[PDB]
Structure 1
Amino acid sequence: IVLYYFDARGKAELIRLIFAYLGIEYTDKRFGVNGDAFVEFKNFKKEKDTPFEQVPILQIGDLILAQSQAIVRYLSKKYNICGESELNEFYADMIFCGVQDIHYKFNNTNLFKQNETTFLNEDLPKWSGYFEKLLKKNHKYYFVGNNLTYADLAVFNLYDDIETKYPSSLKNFPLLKAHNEFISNLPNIKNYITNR
């Protein structure tokens, strides 16, 4: 199993957390660890037939899987972390789609755009509230059902990425803060985090 992406988190960290959580081994190929990233990328697209000329690409054998979102749903169904019912499969999928929304906003805010304030003070809190509510409904902390699913990992990864840029706003959201801390303490993810 080989994962191809740039030497960064971005859209590939969630897949790496899945592999870690589940503990399945693989080769983490990162473009630009030493060389120029774009040349390494430009040359990967030659030697490899990609659907949409974009990474991440997860290679299992001679099989090429593309599109991060599609890749995690696949891994999740195959390894039972997508929920145990029609309905719950849907709810996980639903919150995951929610995570993409705000995660994008996040990656679309920066100094030059003078965008940082309205995100930090408006979009971020609003959305953290949406997640609290979902935790409140399902009331050890899981978003869906009674066992862990990729939605729990995606939410976690979301805030973990946000905090690398901005201060930890989770003070006002106790359940979201707890959930975040809980999955970060899971022995398997905890080891990965420390080795990053």
Structure 2
Amino acid sequence: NIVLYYFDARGKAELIRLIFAYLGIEYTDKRFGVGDAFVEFKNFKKEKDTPFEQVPILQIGDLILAQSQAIVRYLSKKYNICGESELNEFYADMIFCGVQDIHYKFNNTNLFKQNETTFLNEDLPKWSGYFEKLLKKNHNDKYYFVGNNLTYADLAVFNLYDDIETKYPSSLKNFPLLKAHNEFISNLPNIKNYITNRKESVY
């Protein structure tokens, strides 16, 4: 039995949820605070043998899995969406690591208030440019960052801009390949239904 534990938010769990949706995998989506999230989280840590007292936690039977990035890589490798060669697996990894750099900057701004000006004027346009150039290098209909098949890097980049656009909607106007890519991912047979019918608000 597969259980995902996180707060009632998208945040560090949403890419995992997107991956489960894409892969057609059955799981329980357990969210703290759907009463008191604070008390529930305290109870959770005492009940479960957590390595770092953080969520997301993925529990597969009696297996406890922690660290969102490790979980992402574990699933993508298991279900063949990590790239279809050793180098492509690297490139997928490199792109996901890049997503993490800019996502961290967005999180600090969106969540923990650090003024948005720097992010919006300096970080976001510059990083959008990096991703645009990476897509151009590999560029249907279909838009992949790595090879000629969907990788978790595609889902990661999709999730990044989906998260950013919840707070800042007009972020992709100047980046046509990136816009197209994110449109492509959102309309994938297994993604479309999940994204449109998941409860709003995360972070």
SS in 2 for 1:162: helix
CA 27–112 in structure 1, closer or farther in 2 if over 3 Å, else same: closer
Deviation per residue, 1:165-195 (Å, 9 max, x gap) = 1122211100000000001011210000111
| C-alpha spacing 1:48/1:110, structure 2 compared with 1 (3 Å) | closer
Alignment deviations for residues 112-169 of structure 1 (CA, whole Å, 9 cap, x no partner)? 8562112111110000000011001111100000000000000000000001111222
CA 1:113–1:27: 2 relative to 1, 3 Å: closer
How many angstroms apart in 2 are the aligned matches of 1:100 and 1:28? Answer: 23
Scaled by the length of structure 2, the TM-score of the pair is 0.94
Structure 1 counterpart of 2:51? 51
Q: Does 1 or 2 have the higher relative contact order (CA < 8 Å, sep 6+)?
A: 2
Distance 1:118 1:145, change over 3 A: same
Helix, strand or coil at the partner of 2:25: coil
Specify whether residues 186 and 110 from structure 1 end up closer, same or farther in structure 2 by C-alpha distance, changes over 3 A only. Answer: closer
Judging changes above 3 Å, is the alpha-carbon distance between structure 1 residues 84 and 111 closer, same or farther for their aligned structure 2 residues?
A: closer
Instruction: Note if contact 2:13-2:68 (Cα within 8 Å) is conserved in structure 1.
Output: yes
Q: For residues 112 and 15 of structure 2, what CA distance do their matches in structure 1 show?
A: 27
1:18 aligns with 2:7: no
Q: Is contact 2:5-2:29 (8 Å) kept? A: yes
What is the SS of the residue equivalent to 1:109? helix
When residues 112 and 76 of structure 1 are mapped into structure 2, their CA distance, relative to the original with a 3 A threshold, is: closer
Q: Report the CA distance shift for 1:151/1:112 in structure 2 as closer, same or farther (over 3 A).
A: closer
Q: Residue by residue, what CA displacement relative to the aligned partner does 1:52-106 show, whole Å, maximum 9, x if unpaired?
A: 0110000001100000000000000000000011100000000000001000100
Counterparts of 1:168 and 1:78, CA distance in 2: 36
Task: In structure 2, list runs of 5 or more residues that go unmatched.
Answer: 199-203
Query: Kindly, what percent of the aligned residue pairs are identical?
Result: 100
Alpha-carbon distance in structure 1 between the residues aligned to 2:19 and 2:113: 33
Change (3 A) 1:15 1:110: closer
Q: Give 5+ residue unaligned stretches, structure 1.
A: none
SS in 2 for 1:59: strand
Give yes or no for contact 2:8–2:31 (8 Å, CA) kept in 1: yes
Point out the more displaced range, 114-123 or 58-67.
114-123
Cα distance change on mapping 1:123 and 1:26 into 2, 3 Å: same
